Amino acid sequence: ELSGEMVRKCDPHIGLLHRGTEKLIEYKTYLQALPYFDRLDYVSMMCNEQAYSLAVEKLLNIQPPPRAQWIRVLFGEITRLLNHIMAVTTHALDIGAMTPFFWMFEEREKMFEFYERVSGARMHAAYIRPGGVHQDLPLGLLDDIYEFSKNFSFRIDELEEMLTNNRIWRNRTVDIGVVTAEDALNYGFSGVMLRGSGIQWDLRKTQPYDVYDQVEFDVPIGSRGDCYDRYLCRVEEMRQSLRIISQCLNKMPPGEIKVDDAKVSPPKRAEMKTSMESLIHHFKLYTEGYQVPPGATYTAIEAPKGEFGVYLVSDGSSRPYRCKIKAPGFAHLAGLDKMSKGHMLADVVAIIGTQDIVFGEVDR
Amino acid sequence: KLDITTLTGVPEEHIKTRKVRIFVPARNNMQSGVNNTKKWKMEFDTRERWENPLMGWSSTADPLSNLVLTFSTKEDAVAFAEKNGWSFDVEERKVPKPKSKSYGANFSWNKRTRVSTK
Amino acid sequence: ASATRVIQLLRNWASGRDLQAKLQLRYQEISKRTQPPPKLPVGPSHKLSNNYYCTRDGRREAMPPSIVMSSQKEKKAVTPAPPIKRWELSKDQPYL
Amino acid sequence: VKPIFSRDMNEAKRRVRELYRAWYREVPNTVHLFQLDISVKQGRDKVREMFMKNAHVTDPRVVDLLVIKGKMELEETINVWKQRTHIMRFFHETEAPRPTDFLSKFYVGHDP
Amino acid sequence: HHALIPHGKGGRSSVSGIVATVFGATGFLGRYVVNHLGRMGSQVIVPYRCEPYDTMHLRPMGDLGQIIFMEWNGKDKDSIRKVVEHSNVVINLVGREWETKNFDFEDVFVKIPHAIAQVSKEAGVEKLIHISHLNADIKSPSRYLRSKAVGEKEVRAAFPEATIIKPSDIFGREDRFLNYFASMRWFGGVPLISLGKETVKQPVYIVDVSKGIINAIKDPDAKGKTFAFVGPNRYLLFDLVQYIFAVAYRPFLPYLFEVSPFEPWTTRDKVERVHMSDMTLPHLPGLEDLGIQATPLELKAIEVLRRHRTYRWLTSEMEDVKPAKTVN
Amino acid sequence: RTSPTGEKVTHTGQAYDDGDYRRVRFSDRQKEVNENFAIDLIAEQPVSEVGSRVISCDGGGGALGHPRVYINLDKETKTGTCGYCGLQFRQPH
Amino acid sequence: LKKTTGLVGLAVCETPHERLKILYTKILDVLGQIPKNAAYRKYTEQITNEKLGMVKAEPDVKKLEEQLQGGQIEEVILQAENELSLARKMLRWKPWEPLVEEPPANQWKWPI
Amino acid sequence: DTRPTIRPRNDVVHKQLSAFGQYVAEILPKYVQQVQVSCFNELEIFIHPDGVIPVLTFLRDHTNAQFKSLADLTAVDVPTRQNRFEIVYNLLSLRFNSRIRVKTYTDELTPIESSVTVYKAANWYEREIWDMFGVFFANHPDLRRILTDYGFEGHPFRKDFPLSGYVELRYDDEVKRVVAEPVELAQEFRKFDLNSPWEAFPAYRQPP
Amino acid sequence: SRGEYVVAKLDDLVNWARRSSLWPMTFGLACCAVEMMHMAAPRYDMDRFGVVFRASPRQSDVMIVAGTLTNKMAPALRKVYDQMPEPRYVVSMGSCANGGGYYHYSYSVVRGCDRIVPVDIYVPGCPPTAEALLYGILQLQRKIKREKRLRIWYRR
Amino acid sequence: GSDRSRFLEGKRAVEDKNIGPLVKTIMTRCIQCTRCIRFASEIAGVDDLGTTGRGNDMQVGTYIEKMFMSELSGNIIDICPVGALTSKPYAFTARPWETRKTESIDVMDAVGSNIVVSTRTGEVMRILPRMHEDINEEWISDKTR
Amino acid sequence: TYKFVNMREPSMDMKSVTDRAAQTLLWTELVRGLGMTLSYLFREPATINYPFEKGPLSPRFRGEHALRRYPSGEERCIACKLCEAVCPAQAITIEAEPRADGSRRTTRYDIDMTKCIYCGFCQEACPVDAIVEGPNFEFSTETHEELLYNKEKLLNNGDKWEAEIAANIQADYLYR
Ligand SMILES: NC(=O)C1=CN([C@@H]2O[C@H](COP(=O)(O)OP(=O)(O)OC[C@H]3O[C@@H](n4cnc5c(N)ncnc54)[C@H](OP(=O)(O)O)[C@@H]3O)[C@@H](O)[C@H]2O)C=CC1
Ligand code: SF4
Ligand code: SF4
Ligand code: SF4
Ligand code: SF4
Ligand code: SF4
């Protein structure tokens, strides 16, 4: 409802990408349900798998091997770079700045190669699986990751050189979509939304998961709650992600990549073709699937767009009874009208960008 | 009697024509496990499954062909069928009778039970 | 990159940074696609003794949730957990 | 049991009549707004048909929820949230009529 | 030989056991015929001579592997053979209202129909549905109607049990009859021979004709019977055009194109056929015989002519034009 | 092999019959048929003679083959056939 | 003096000690209205007494913030306001009453 | 047990959560029906549906329970219970770095008080619950379909709703619009029975 | 003949223009849109081929359905498609757009965009790699190159 | 059981024995449970099956080449815990998880044996006994199967 | 642990104010950004010359599904159907009968690529390395029917791409 050029009531209509993923998950095994999570947030793929993997592991009362946890965090931060690149560049692209999109997307293409080198697929990997990771890193992958991260900092700085100080960019972001800290908490905002208003909350710090407790980084905190501060927060998150990536590349431990339980993680192909027990488990795990002990949990991680949680409900079978998916974008878009009050039409575009709304996760 | 039929959204054809069967699944004769045969289940009547001309894949128009609902007790299934207004046929659970077994009888002195080979 | 020294100088000056030091295009620092055959290790349970699954069956060691209180048949105030400690300002870069 | 909105069936019937009035008055505008090819009578006939479909209900709670759902459809229709196809979906057109005679069903297929 | 048991619920994924070769499917009546066959789940073999791009509209009308497009040539009998070999039903809709460089009214309405009928009988096709015109007459002056009747006789000779249908001025969204009148703006006012005061036409709805064709295929006694698809009411040409311009919000101004190498705007035969009052044959079965109930032009008039509105009649004023007087 | 209709018979013994309307799908398009019948190919493979009473076949290549299976050669008339590969092994007379 | 609270929408209070004391007194009175047996009253009175004693004891705002462990003193003021509103709502709700109704049969049984 | 396969369990958090659950139960005996802490340290409070607003308000405003963030509000459909739908509220307390779950029950007809007053995030969550499961929420600011189609009929996430649905969409040339027709699948979704006939977890065995 | 030669050459000229300067509209619906962006990213650079992303569907020639076409979005897709000017070509990217892919049996997913709009080129994958999508566009260009619209008009 | 194997030696292989045109026999998979022998000896009443040899070389089956003929022979397929005995018609046709089960009654005889019709993709794949202590217990005739 | 983005007070030194006003009036930062894009102009473009130049790919790449054969020439597929079960999109349809020889050879191995999600679970499940996703990503079709792959199509794809598929498996089987 626009008063000529002023936004009064911005009613967000969603469901244009509602594919009934949660119901489809219930009709499939836990392993078969993993690829669905890749699609949910089609910008951050492996991060989605990690949240689902942690939930299944928690119900399974198993622990992924130490190497896999470091591998998960390393690619998790690589995944965080992917989304932050996408969020900032596409937001700038909609605002009008088109050059930064192409500059950083080539780096995004390089990171996609890292996905394909370790999983065989560019975007959807299904690499982080409940119990660890599917395979070990291909020899030489870590070295190339170091090369990319070494030159990636310059690329982020080039982005800042073209946007951060630009007065037009500031005018389109500063004092736009300001959210009070109390409103953000009450409206269920998470991730950059909370940090943008100054709320010092980050799951990787407050509730460490995997080996995030064994890495050192800094949580960017906003001061004004406008789009510009959140833009700075997302940029700084990219910088701090490189810090985590460097640590992981220097601390990657030797070991296996899957939990050493052939009743949860499928045995190695050589073992499957030699051991009678391995073949039985390989047959059962891929046909029936591992039975998850009856129970329910809400495991949430600090996904690139915010808190990504999965309410997994297990009935003791190999297929989940109920899998509710907490999408950070869902709550953020619900508060779009509150943020859009007293703004112009162009401001709404900026507010959409600062919330990093992917309708795949919003419509689930 | 709760009448949720108007609120379910099920088409009228699949509210009246359907013949729900409340039953406890039988044990697969191939295996000896009985864990499957412990909860009541509700299934709908099977209907036509023709062949897709292009590939030969089986095609169906029954929307409720794959719907199987597990229920703790028979009364729960009956109530759920009544709520949704589906004609329901209930099969009483068949529990195997306790059978007296004696290993000694295999070596009986004057009984048929004596086994010829072990 | 295969650029003339003049072009390199102009590029660096316009950017304000030595771009030749960190060129985005990958030339030779890339790892060889063909790699030596790997030998992945075995897990902690790849042993011929003291490997009974009963001692490592975490899936079967899960228990039903403990019922603290059920309506069906001076204490101090209790918080859900100790209050969160104030975060400390970063020492590498306090203010961006 | 807590009533949804109406404690008695008479109260529920009051809500039903209120909804029927709104639908009856909205039909002419709806035909104009979506440029439907149905007549105003046709739309009002469909409205009455839809109301008469759920005419066997006796629980006030169920009637309340039916009215709520009826309101929601009206809100979308009034706010042009629905599209032209959405409004026409009420008037099943392409769907071939399925016969009711047993002999006809016998010829048609194995339909039970 | 090619007899298929129908299986399914009559939906898109069902099997109706109707392998049909709809000749001239890329046409006004062709689309609706294919759509009805497709929605029932029939193997619609589409012979086409135009660009495949022009046939894309028929692709979404059927399920996977149900609409098969194969090139055919009206001058090649072999092309007709390979397109009707496995078909159990063949529907002939090939007809152009204007003669072309390489195709004359004789070729389109005699030679091509006869070749189709002859080949279909040799192939063993169970039923053939030829589409004539109600005003087709052996001694009719217009070449269109005269040639159509000539081919009709030859169709019966080659295909003895052919089910010949004779529609009368089919109208619909992509029709050349209602839209043609509403296009009189290009032709000055409303060119009407003698103000079109001696011509009464009986227009038939497009879906009614298409449904009748499908019903005729299913009908076991329709074989060998010459059906005549008539409209619900007979309208005076002047009144009909007045009604057309009325719902089209067009000023009614009651008042060479063959030369055009691109699709001629107007044909001399078309002009004669327009001013020729529709015949009335009460000795032939009609839509009611096939069960289809004729739909009045009034109900479906707006769907065809609202799109021809000028400024503010599809909204705002939206004056309702009463039904035009019918000469019945 | 080719059917009397002229349609090449697949190794699955499938060939659209003359009365089959579905044969129209290959009117202007070729019928994809694999031209290396597997059953014939193994028949070409010679029967190995191994003196041991029990032999094990992995299909060759170790982890690139099939689950190792042990075959018994007591039967004199019959030749031990691999369950997965299908290779035939015999005990020298 | 603190320039800003950091959190957007939260303003620095020039007289935090006095404000906290007044709010705590209001809270204590409202809890006094609550029946003594109610656990809410007992626990909340304990907490408020602790906080009020610390507020009166420590005059330094920063040391008081560290002592209360409730974050910035403005955040503590907000917490006090929330607690007071909750106490009034509790007086309305009377949650110290017995259970409304036991769960029907096995309403909390998993797996089925 | 020990060794990498088993997941390490922290007993301290278990004790803390149990104590806080008892705390909440004592403060709210009127509504709290049962308190459970899972072995993976997740406190769950079961509350009578009438107590949705009071219990949440206590868990949000109380100084020692500052759960000011509605992480996720969902529903679980168990058809074997009279109150088939189970409304579950997931909360987060930043002050104490903890989470809690409020689980309530409801029927297909009994309304549930909207928690929009407690948490503004509840708006869209409750809209989704109503759209997918059909749980009406009383005093809701705008309760309407949020995820399904505008003219959709039925609640999809209900266990009795078919996975493929009852209706399908396609474009029809005759009507020149996208039309809804009864669902007909070329390949029926192949139901796979995977449940093993042998019991897997003795700890969760229901005695006959 | 000379007439055929003139018509054929003119038809080739028209075909060249359209295939060289194809203007696609990004109907990005789901995950496949991301790979479509990577196609326009510097590494592949669809613009190098003359394929420039035309935001305005009224000035577009190719509709790249990239993502899962839900029932709610289905009417919009067709309505946008018929508002496209001709010649108009539809390229289905991704298994979800092709036949529903992962959500084929979903209650609110169209079983392929082919039902709603006629499709010319189907790009397989989930998501199809940017080269595969680029390969599909080049295949569409070759498809346009084979078109003989004028020749058929002359030979009619 | 456990999740891995310590058997570093070579496995044994047993020559298969033909017992008829209905029960496909792969004795390499036999676990020497003696269920088939006991069933043949007591329920079927045909004393043909037995153990030959001793130790790890103990083979189960008729010592001579004899066909196990019985009207209830098919049930030995069901009793066999492992896939040593498999239905020859049903062999290689389908897997258990995909087959849909429909409880039914046999009509070949007037016993009224309860059967489970395993159908996949709208095609009867196999017929399995349904437990009914009063009529067919756990066995069905070979004709019925 | 936490870093303050923004949160930087501006100095009111007359020199600092002068430089800030200079930035505002003389548009210095805009010129800086303009120079950055100009620098990007003189860099080397990263566009590969498709299809003459192909993008980098790893041996683990997942693409067109393909049915493989043993070196003897027998189809590896022994109709276990577990790849059909594991398939998260239910795209594989397998029907098998005892072959004339007597082995488990499928009579129908149909996978609709239009429904497959190219996850790779099928190749990870197959116990004989029969179904393996190949390296071909460029197999776009013009008709929907073509995407639905028959068993014959899969066998032909395996025969065509066998060299590369075998090489990639040999280069990756150790990791798996
Ligand atoms: N109102 C009416 O239109 C009435 C028409 N009829 C007759 O019924 C049929 C209806 O045709 P309709 O569907 O409306 O299509 P149109 O008359 O609008 O278009 C011509 C149709 O005939 C085909 N056609 C014409 N000439 C040739 C040719 N030389 N070779 C091959 N195909 C050809 C066209 O296919 P293509 O474009 O590929 O050449 C197209 O299908 C025609 O036979 C018509 O004469 C009878 C009564 C009323
Ligand atoms: S095909 Fe795959 S990547 Fe593309 S929209 Fe569908 S799920 Fe997403
Ligand atoms: S029933 Fe089977 S496993 Fe048991 S002894 Fe007989 S053949 Fe061996
Ligand atoms: S399925 Fe059972 S009987 Fe067959 S080989 Fe495996 S473990 Fe042995
Ligand atoms: S998993 Fe391998 S062996 Fe089994 S059916 Fe599939 S392709 Fe054949
Ligand atoms: S790769 Fe994935 S989608 Fe493709 S056939 Fe294998 S399991 Fe199915």
Would you write up a description of this structure?
The structure is cut from a larger assembly and holds eleven protein chains of eleven kinds. With 96 residues, chain C is low in regular secondary structure. Chain C contains one helix and one strand, in the order H-E. With 112 residues, chain G is mainly alpha-helical. Chain G has helices at residues 16-33, 39-57, 61-68, 73-93. In chain G, helix 1 runs antiparallel to helix 2 (39-57) and helix 1 runs parallel beside helix 4 (73-93). Chain H is globular and about 70 Å long. Chain H starts with 10 loop residues before the first helix and ends in a 26-residue tail after the last strand. At the A-H interface, helix 1, helix 3, helix 8, strand 5 and strand 6 of A face strand 3 of H. The structure holds NADPH dihydro-nicotinamide-adenine-dinucleotide phosphate (NDP) and iron/sulfur cluster (5 copies). NADPH dihydro-nicotinamide-adenine-dinucleotide phosphate (NDP) binds at residues 24, 26-30, 48-50, 74, 93-97, 103, 108, 131, 133, 167, 169-170, 176-177 of chain E. The site of NADPH dihydro-nicotinamide-adenine-dinucleotide phosphate has 24 residues of chain E, from helix 1. Chain A: One of its GO terms (cellular component) is respiratory chain complex I. Chain A: It catalyses: a ubiquinone + NADH + 5 H(+)(in) = a ubiquinol + NAD(+) + 4 H(+)(out). Chain A: It comes from Sus scrofa.
Explain the layout of strands and helices:
The structure is cut from a larger assembly and holds eleven protein chains of eleven kinds.
Chain D: H1 9-33, H2 40-53, H3 60-78, H4 84-89, H5 102-108
Helix pairs in contact in D: 1-2, 1-3
Chain F: H1 38-44, E1 48-49, E2 54-57, E3 69-72, E4 80-81, E5 88-90
Parallel strand pairs in F: 1-5
Antiparallel strand pairs in F: 2-3, 4-5
Chain I: H1 2-20, E1 24-28, H2 32-40, E2 62-66, H3 74-82, E3 89-93, H4 95-99, E4 121-123, H5 130-146, H6 149-154
Helix pairs in contact in I: 1-5, 2-5
The structure holds NADPH dihydro-nicotinamide-adenine-dinucleotide phosphate (NDP) and iron/sulfur cluster (5 copies).
